[PDB]
Symmetry: D2
Subunit: 208 residues, 4 copies
Amino acid sequence: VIQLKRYEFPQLPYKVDALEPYISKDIIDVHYNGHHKGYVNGANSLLDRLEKLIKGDLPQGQYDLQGILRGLTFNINGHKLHAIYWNNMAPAGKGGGKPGGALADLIDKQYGSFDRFKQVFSESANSLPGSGWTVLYYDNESGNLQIMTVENHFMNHIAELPVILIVDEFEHAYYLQYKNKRGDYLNAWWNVVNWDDAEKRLQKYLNK
Amino acid sequence: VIQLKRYEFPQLPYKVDALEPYISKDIIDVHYNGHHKGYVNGANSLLDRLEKLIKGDLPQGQYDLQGILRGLTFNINGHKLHAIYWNNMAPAGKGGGKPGGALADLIDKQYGSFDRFKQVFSESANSLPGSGWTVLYYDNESGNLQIMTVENHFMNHIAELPVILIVDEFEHAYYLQYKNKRGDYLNAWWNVVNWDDAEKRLQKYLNK
Amino acid sequence: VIQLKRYEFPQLPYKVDALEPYISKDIIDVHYNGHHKGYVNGANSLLDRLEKLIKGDLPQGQYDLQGILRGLTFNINGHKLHAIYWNNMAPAGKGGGKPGGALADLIDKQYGSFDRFKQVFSESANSLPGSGWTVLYYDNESGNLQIMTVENHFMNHIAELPVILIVDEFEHAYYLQYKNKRGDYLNAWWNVVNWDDAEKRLQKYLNK
Amino acid sequence: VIQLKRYEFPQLPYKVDALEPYISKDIIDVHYNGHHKGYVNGANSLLDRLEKLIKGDLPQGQYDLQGILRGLTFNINGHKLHAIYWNNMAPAGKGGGKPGGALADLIDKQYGSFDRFKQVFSESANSLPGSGWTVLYYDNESGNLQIMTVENHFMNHIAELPVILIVDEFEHAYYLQYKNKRGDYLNAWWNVVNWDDAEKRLQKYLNK
Ligand SMILES: [Fe+3]
Ligand SMILES: [Fe+3]
Ligand SMILES: [Fe+3]
Ligand SMILES: [Fe+3]
């Protein structure tokens, strides 16, 4: 009777030091156990309030709806985006390299080559004003692999499009190790990208 | 060799006066032939520039990337959201009423009844500060039908989630007929909602 | 004992039909008596809640602070910006023309001439994505007359800078008369600009 | 002939280790020499482009206006806000304590006491979703000392209002020392607040 489901904190796909030396375990530890866990808790605590509101246990005058709704995009996106992020990376050996399969083929057709794509993606990522993410969506309508800079966790998303590749650009994602050198972090990140994961996500929407 | 696909302007699913008296033909005409068409043109014109940039025809110093990327979320979302909007409505007789199928079942389980859902959805829609949309997403992860107010065409979306129900709240969607009476417009809109379309969208992601 | 002041609804500097034929009285009437009045009421109603919160009459758990704070930037800016807007315009005869005094001098030095300034200001105003305003600030630090497109009523402002010139670009500011032809409205607006008001605002910060 | 002025990088009002132990010199060093300097450089580089555009040296098709304008609010605000921030703090001994003068009087009248104000200001600061600032404006219109959470450097400002008190909440402002413990940083910050500077800013707008 009147009930919403809550989110679960996912498990890290590897050990906290599996991405070294590109991303120190010091960062992964707090990034995962601190920030990500916090987004799940924040989202669940706001879902409790929304649930009470829907039931009538929280009467008008005892809440400010915009505070609950905006708090949910922030926290829900924070959780979902980090969940993709962890899986979109892989330990030094398994991760990195060049893409393959349909993904490699689309990148060639739309960017000319993986090198140009890397150049354009990096340029876009460096253009992001402040904290956010840079994502690569697959547009089933046009068939384009669309690059986009996302501000915070919830601004600039293209509705319904699946994420193929993603980089976290919040300062907590690299500060302990790279400080204000975001460009250095971005160059390092390329070495731990999990192209298998990326190709798997693409295959899920190809010709569907 | 290096080429991105462009977007196509879709056809209206009915005559421009098919939603009367809830939404006058004067609004539908310019909303569709004016605004929507403009988003498709704007998106395509920006894709041309991005394509040139990728090819190298547009050299560094002859563009401002953030202007191109942010212009794209604005226009692409403007197009995609309007495309759903037209299909999410139906002529007086065909549209309106109460939902059915899996959608009606989920609404009862999470909101208690269609009447409460209507109340909560309307309350959320009326809380939107300024121009934007109010959407109902289906979260495959939690199984929740999440309500959200989207600012402009690109702020507050929850990444990757499909749109099940949607209402345009930009002033151009009702001003000619309702003026500043946004609440009156929202009450009228319920009479043209296409629940068949909504149920179809949900069925696409159920148990998948 | 613990009390915040509320905002007062200002009087229109002229009759609702004083800006015709550039801006119809139909627009001014609802724009002033409808929208502006609504921002003052919205801001005051939120100030009541914040006041109760500060006093302790509204206990934790009966409010969502972000909903109150963000609601205040929206409404307070909505009120303040419209208040400047009304005074920044003048009836056909009194308004329009070319600026004079220190303002005309600065525009010449920074834009080459009033014609170029008009061209650049119009180009910026037309580039605004969605609803908002285009403003001309006077930067006391650098001495520059900075143009800026403001999204909604509260995004993109440059902290502490005074507004010298301003155009409302929310759809309700021109829709009844120009429909989706925002560019036509912008061209018309130039005919009712109150340069005396603009020069007065500038003089207030020159050499101070 | 057609020329805009550029911004100058200000000097730190004290040594980079003058705020210890509340804010380590490691943070101040890169925060000042890295981040702040970068905002000044970013702003000036964009002003160069805008200047060229105005002169005609940068022809249409070789720039994306929104990229230039939005890049300017980001950078100009980043610079101006940091400039206030440095002056709004003072070495352990000189800074901290309780406010005095007109400021202390207004806080008592509107918040009941400095302790409540501190509680409310801290509650607001901790509610900020993501990176940004929490500011205290003085509204000459109403006479209220308005608290506000600013997202990034440019979202949520109330037009034209002067900043009286301010706290940087971008992760780079405390991560090296406090990691994700933003609340701990906010508690420490109260010990270095420069109330003399704050009172001076207020006196500038009182009865004027
Ligand atoms: Fe992160
Ligand atoms: Fe629309
Ligand atoms: Fe307006
Ligand atoms: Fe900072």
